[PDB]
Amino acid sequence: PAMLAALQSQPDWAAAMDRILALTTRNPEAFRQQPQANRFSAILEAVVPSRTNPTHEKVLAIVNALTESKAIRKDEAGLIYNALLERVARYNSTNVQANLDRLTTDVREAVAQRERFMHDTNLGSQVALNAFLSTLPANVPRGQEDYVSFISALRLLVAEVPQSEVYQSGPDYFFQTSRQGLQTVNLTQAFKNLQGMWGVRSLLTPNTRLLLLLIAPFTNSSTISRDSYLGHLITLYREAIGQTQVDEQTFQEITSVSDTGSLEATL
Amino acid sequence: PRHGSRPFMGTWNEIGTSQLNGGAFS
Amino acid sequence: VAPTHDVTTDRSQRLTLRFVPVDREDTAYSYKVRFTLAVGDNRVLDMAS
């Protein structure tokens, strides 16, 4: 967000007194040959460099930052830029003209948090979930305490699938997405229909089934035993996921050999 | 009628500055 | 920008040079003139001129 300001403005002096002096490597005999007008319009630069006025540049180094995180929309950085320039062209001083400098050489460096924001989704995945888990009932359900293993598999899923896995709080009911596409929106305040079977050995509306199928991959010997339903189903969903991988590769193979066809004797 | 004729590895008008006839300027 | 000192010359060259005829023989149906073309030195004349 700065070199995009460098690569939007500011067309050096070492590179100029490295060429006039003929200290380059590839073609030293470069500056000598130019017309004796250029060679007298580049020698009086690396002999008495001309000052500059950097405000615009680093101000453009701030706009290109805002509009890349999300404030000032892409189409408004022609009013924001003028407004910022005129503000910093009023109150300017070594005061502000520096306070910028720090802002521009910190905003491009203090981007690690932003990177973190999208590397553990600690923006709407764990802060939301670790909020929703605090809206759950007490952590002592009656039947079993396979509860905690499931509720931890949920956190692991949300933390190890950065894709989007956003956890909205679309009003009273917090709902889990499986991707920004969102074609597996399962309601996470509607598994207070699993605070039923948390411990037993057709009452699951697929919404609950959707959550089970969504996390299952991330369950191993955790939700465990023959803890009824919740146990097996998870195991059966994992088995079905493996079989689905098998059938996926099989169908690609059988359609690369060559119409419903494979879809029948696969499904 | 025959032409052939030589001189064609391109042209120079080298840079660091650009072409001749002027573009626009009596 | 034009090219400088390396294509032109400050020494007094000439642009249009007379070559008054050296020898002019003759006949009825003909005409012989023999000039002595001098291309100076370091000059480069192209015949088309």
From Swiss-Prot, chain B:
The organism's taxonomic lineage, starting at the top: Viruses, Varidnaviria, Bamfordvirae, Preplasmiviricota, Tectiliviricetes
Family: Belongs to the adenoviridae protein VI family.
Site feature (Cleavage) residues: G23, A24
More about this protein: All late proteins expressed from the major late promoter are produced by alternative splicing and alternative polyadenylation of the same gene giving rise to non-overlapping ORFs. A leader sequence is present in the N-terminus of all these mRNAs and is recognized by the viral shutoff protein to provide expression although conventional translation via ribosome scanning from the cap has been shut off in the host cell.
Full-protein interval shown: 11 to 36 of 266
Induction: Expressed in the late phase of the viral replicative cycle.
Gene: L3
Protein name: Pre-protein VI
Domain remarks in the Swiss-Prot or TrEMBL record: N-terminal amphipathic alpha-helix domain is essential for the membrane lytic activity.
Maturation and modification: Ubiquitinated by Nedd4 following partial capsid disassembly; which might play a role in intracellular virus movement during entry.
Curated annotation (Swiss-Prot), chain C:
Induction per the UniProt record: Expressed in the late phase of the viral replicative cycle.
Subcellular location: Virion; Host nucleus
Highest taxon of source: Viruses
Function: Major capsid protein that self-associates to form 240 hexon trimers, each in the shape of a hexagon, building most of the pseudo T=25 capsid. Assembled into trimeric units with the help of the chaperone shutoff protein. Transported by pre-protein VI to the nucleus where it associates with other structural proteins to form an empty capsid. Might be involved, through its interaction with host dyneins, in the intracellular microtubule-dependent transport of incoming viral capsid to the nucleus.
Extra remark beyond the main annotation: All late proteins expressed from the major late promoter are produced by alternative splicing and alternative polyadenylation of the same gene giving rise to non-overlapping ORFs. A leader sequence is present in the N-terminus of all these mRNAs and is recognized by the viral shutoff protein to provide expression although conventional translation via ribosome scanning from the cap has been shut off in the host cell.
Family that this chain belongs to: Belongs to the adenoviridae hexon protein family.
Subunit annotation: Homotrimer. Interacts with the capsid vertex protein; this interaction binds the peripentonal hexons to the neighboring penton base. Interacts with the hexon-linking protein; this interaction tethers the hexons surrounding the penton to those situated in the central plate of the facet. Interacts with the hexon-interlacing protein; this interaction lashes the hexons together. Interacts with host dyneins DYNC1LI1 and DYNC1I2; this interaction might be involved in intracellular microtubule-dependent transport of incoming viral capsid.
Designated name of the protein: Hexon protein
